[PDB]
Amino acid sequence: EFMTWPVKDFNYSDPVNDNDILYLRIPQNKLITTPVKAFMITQNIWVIPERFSSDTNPSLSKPPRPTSKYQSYYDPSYLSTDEQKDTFLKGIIKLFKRINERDIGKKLINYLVVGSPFMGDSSTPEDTFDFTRHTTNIAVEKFENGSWKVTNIITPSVLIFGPLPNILDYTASLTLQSNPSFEGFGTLSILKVAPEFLLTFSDVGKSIFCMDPVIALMHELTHSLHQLYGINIPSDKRIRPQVSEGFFSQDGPNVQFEELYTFGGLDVEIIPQIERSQLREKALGHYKDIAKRLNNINKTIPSSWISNIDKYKKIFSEKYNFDKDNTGNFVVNIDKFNSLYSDLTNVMSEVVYSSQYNVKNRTHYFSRHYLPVFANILDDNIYTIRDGFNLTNKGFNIENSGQNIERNPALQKL
Ligand SMILES: [K+]
Ligand SMILES: [Zn+2]
């Protein structure tokens, strides 16, 4: 047996309870300017069945610009009804239970739960925890006497929204001065996913397969992992996995370091070893910074929240895997740092998940896609927690044939 965080069942219609079903204000979502109903399916992991856009003038319609025939899909009405929001909630729940099917996923989920973003950033004085930042806090609101008001905060790890205007787009958000997600402190992670809408790839018409939505979700949660542990590499940093290649260069896509690390495998080595070593020693330096901070904290923001100091010294010293020295000071044990960093940036990667879950998956991050598909993953005759699409039905357990577009009538054209 291996330690497993429980995943709670919910109906969209279940009443708010001031515990794990709440109304939250999420200002980062420019498409919605009012509080929205949210469900804590596992500690610090909240599902928010709403569309998302951080665009200034947001619209869910197909824009008048280039879009991919294979990697984009638009439907402004999707996730507008309570039925669809129930379906979405139950879909994420089901995928989390499927994540828990392997110890690698159980460990991923634990890392997210215990990975709370730091109470502070580089502007924060060393002796101070700041409890007031939107990198850690989301507001809880209640509708009282005809209007909404803020009543409390939560400190989540991950918020799981429904999709962007492009329902197929799971890629890491462009960060994106002060960058806590790259400076050890970390930040809460906001995901935008759509588990019934699936990209396709070829294992080279008969060679075309759908991505298992648990793999897509886990890829996204691997981004969350990086963000929470403050090692998310800026979308700035890219490399062409080709390339030149000589006289008739040049480059295919410029792929983000963050994406290569999240996908994993041998393509990571496209990034020069010196740059990869520099990313690790950066993290190490930040983690050591945070150890020092825990040793020195004696005051808070707000000033009156001092009784939370000891609670959070324990939360963060556990998150970062610090030791004590003989003087009772937290220190970075380099071996424990190496193990955590290697888990975060190597063990937790898409190609490892594809192996561990007995699913077919794309060969490379930058592998091509084919026509996308749709599936009702809540029907256990189509998709189960134990087996995904690769059910014993019709022999779909053989050679991942459940994921094969031509073989499986349940994988519907979009
Ligand atoms: K089909
Ligand atoms: Zn990604």
UniProtKB/Swiss-Prot annotation:
The active site is at residue 220. It comes from the Viruses. Inhibited by dipicolinic acid, captopril, 1,10-phenanthroline and EDTA. It is found in: Secreted. Zn(2+) binds at residues 219, 223, 259. Signal peptide: none annotated. Has proteolytic activity. After translocation into the eukaryotic host cytosol, inhibits neurotransmitter release by acting as a zinc endopeptidase that cleaves the '61-Lys-|-Leu-62' bond of synaptobrevin-1 (VAMP1), and the equivalent 'Lys-|-Leu' sites in VAMP2 and VAMP3. Cleaves the '49-Lys-|-Ile-50' bond of A.californica synaptobrevin (AC P35589). This chain probably has to be partially unfolded to translocate into the eukaryotic host cell cytosol. Has protease activity. This is Botulinum neurotoxin D light chain. It comes from Clostridium botulinum D phage (Clostridium botulinum D bacteriophage). The gene is botD. The chain holds residues 1 to 424 of 1276 of the full protein.
